[PDB]
Design an enzyme around this catalytic site. Structure first.
Site, PDB file in Angstrom:
ATOM      1  N   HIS A  36       0.811  -1.217   0.000  1.00  0.00           N
ATOM      2  CA  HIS A  36       0.000   0.000   0.000  1.00  0.00           C
ATOM      3  C   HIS A  36       0.843   1.266   0.000  1.00  0.00           C
ATOM      4  O   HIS A  36       0.278   2.365  -0.019  1.00  0.00           O
ATOM      5  CB  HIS A  36      -1.003  -0.001   1.164  1.00  0.00           C
ATOM      6  CG  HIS A  36      -0.404   0.150   2.532  1.00  0.00           C
ATOM      7  ND1 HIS A  36      -0.421  -0.868   3.462  1.00  0.00           N
ATOM      8  CD2 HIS A  36       0.160   1.215   3.150  1.00  0.00           C
ATOM      9  CE1 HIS A  36       0.139  -0.448   4.586  1.00  0.00           C
ATOM     10  NE2 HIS A  36       0.495   0.815   4.427  1.00  0.00           N
TER      11      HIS A  36
ATOM     12  N   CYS B 104       4.277   0.884   9.376  1.00  0.00           N
ATOM     13  CA  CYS B 104       4.150  -0.184   8.387  1.00  0.00           C
ATOM     14  C   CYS B 104       5.491  -0.624   7.796  1.00  0.00           C
ATOM     15  O   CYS B 104       6.368   0.187   7.520  1.00  0.00           O
ATOM     16  CB  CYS B 104       3.244   0.284   7.271  1.00  0.00           C
ATOM     17  SG  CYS B 104       1.528   0.212   7.747  1.00  0.00           S
TER      18      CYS B 104
ATOM     19  N   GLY C 185       3.447   5.522   9.875  1.00  0.00           N
ATOM     20  CA  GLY C 185       4.810   5.243   9.510  1.00  0.00           C
ATOM     21  C   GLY C 185       5.366   3.930  10.015  1.00  0.00           C
ATOM     22  O   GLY C 185       6.488   3.571   9.646  1.00  0.00           O
TER      23      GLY C 185
END
Ligand code: WIO
Lengths: 301, 300
Positions: A40, A144, A142
């Site tokens: 993503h 991820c 942030g």
């Protein structure tokens, strides 16, 4: 004297990089000439509502990916989508690449999380894969691409990469082949994890940790059978105890001279009676994020 | 959604070595060309009841000290005792030496522990220095010489080295100059830590963490005064709250729009009324090993 303990994180710190694409930045895992990160990253904010990842990835080219390993940009020379993760091939192989493998963990198992932001480690802690395939983590924007892992021998076993938060505050992500744990999808919509249950075999492990640590008020004369105990556990949304769970707990039983089924009778009492205001290992609740393995590793070094 | 969290341990792993003197083995900390370890490595089992460390050390020479960084045997060229720590000068500076300083932490402050055995790290976790200068760790035999530390920027501040366990199960050790935290001595005799107290400012910080994480059932419509709240804190063995504490908590009061004294009122009631069986951040107890700093760093 029994704490939630994470594995040393050094072998993993040297694998974290920064991955940017547009104005979206998150963390990648640099192993050999490949950087793995959540797909993503290629989404704008509009796209996240209902993205067509194949279509979105077509419009992208190698040079739309700014990968930074510290003060160094690495050149992306390739890209594939594998389920929900992106693999950016890079022109440099990580010299800090440890001996490693990818595993898909089972619910009830634990692992350490190296929480990172902008490709920099901020902290490490221990997690369990809940029976409903979520984890109760500490993840901000942030975070991820942060990874979960075990260390066995010299070998790093990567088992988790972080993708999303659910409305209950828990967390969801994938293995390192991009397949989610649980029924989740990487799109921005409210999603249900379903009823969580308590990891019974881990609670018994923690009660053995309590005995091993001079904390035994909860033991009784009684006992029970696996069948009768599960009658009770069902009522309180405890996983049912198998015989394999009894044999897993064998070594802890050996160290304490307390048969698993005797201990089950103690837990049966605690569920029906409650803690009465006493504590176990300084906890006012029953703790279910230690495997038998974790207890052995800690209580004998 | 808020966990106890340790610093990344990589910069410190590469400093851990194995120190053997006789049959005793424990961990040492290799920085530049000096290895720091607890001095009781020179003790036999008999000696530990009441050692004369000066006398015990005389009988040792450099070559009685075996040091290994992994499989690399380092040669010892010098030895001195500084308070309760031995410094062994070695013939090789550690190529992995990070930017470091030695600090002596204040009670109520927290740090990460890299638990080691035989010079190899086994795990890491977060500790607080209790008001009575003990810590609640997980240390077994051979864990001595493990270190506690903070990381700010690229700089490792070493603040703890582990030496012993007390009969209550809590732990005691020294700073990296070998001065104990607290009244303790490195001999194998019964020793009292004295009444522990609760780190009030840390509990307030944790209640703020809770509100930041969507958990506010404990808030109220009452308020209170510093002096009034402290009268109740004495009752429950809580460190008293200073206006320094109030100002340290200033950033958290902002983020939530709850004034410290209003939070003090909510705390007073939890101390008086109990948790009524409910929870806060998944704990059925009040937690006091998060500094305001830790809460900020985690929630932002
Ligand atoms: C480091 O190798 C060990 C760690 C210790 C063993 C069990 N858990 C731990 O954290 N430290 C020691 O063996 C010391 C060495 C002496 C020279 C201080 N001894 C010790 O910790 O003994 C613990 C018990 C048996 C409780 O005795 C003591 C010792 C000191 C003070 C006490 F109050 C009680």
């Amino acid at each position: 004297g029994f704490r939630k303990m994470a594995f040393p994180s050094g072998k993993v710190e040297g694998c974290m990089v920064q991955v940017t694409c547009g104005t979206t930045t998150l963390n990648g895992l640099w192993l050999d000439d490949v950087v793995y990160c959540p797909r993503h990253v290629i989404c704008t904010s509009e796209d996240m509502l209902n993205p067509n990842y194949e279509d979105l990835l077509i419009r992208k080219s190698n040079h739309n990916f700014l990968v930074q390993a510290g003060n160094v940009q690495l050149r992306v020379i390739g890209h594939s989508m594998q389920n929900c993760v992106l693999k950016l091939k890079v022109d440099t192989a990580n010299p800090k690449t440890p001996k490693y493998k990818f595993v898909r963990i089972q619910p009830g198992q634990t692992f350490s999380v190296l929480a990172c932001y902008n490709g920099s480690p901020s902290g490490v802690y221990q997690c369990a894969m809940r029976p409903n395939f979520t984890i109760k983590g500490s993840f901000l924007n942030g975070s991820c691409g942060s990874v979960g892992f075990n260390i066995d021998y010299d070998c790093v076993s990567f088992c988790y990469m972080h993708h999303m938060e659910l409305p209950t505050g828990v967390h969801a992500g994938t293995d390192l082949e991009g397949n989610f744990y649980g029924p989740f999808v990487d799109r921005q919509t409210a999603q249900a994890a379903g009823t969580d249950t308590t990891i019974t075999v881990n609670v018994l492990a923690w009660l053995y940790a309590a005995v091993i640590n001079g904390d035994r008020w909860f033991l009784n004369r009684f006992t029970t059978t696996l069948n009768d105990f599960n009658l009770v556990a069902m009522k309180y949304n405890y996983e049912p105890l198998t015989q394999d769970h009894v044999d897993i707990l064998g070594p802890l039983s050996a160290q304490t001279g307390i048969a698993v089924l005797d201990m089950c009778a103690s837990l049966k009492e605690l569920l029906q009676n409650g803690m009465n205001g006493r504590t176990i290992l300084g906890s006012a609740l029953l703790e279910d994020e230690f495997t038998p393995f974790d207890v052995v590793r800690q209580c004998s070094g």
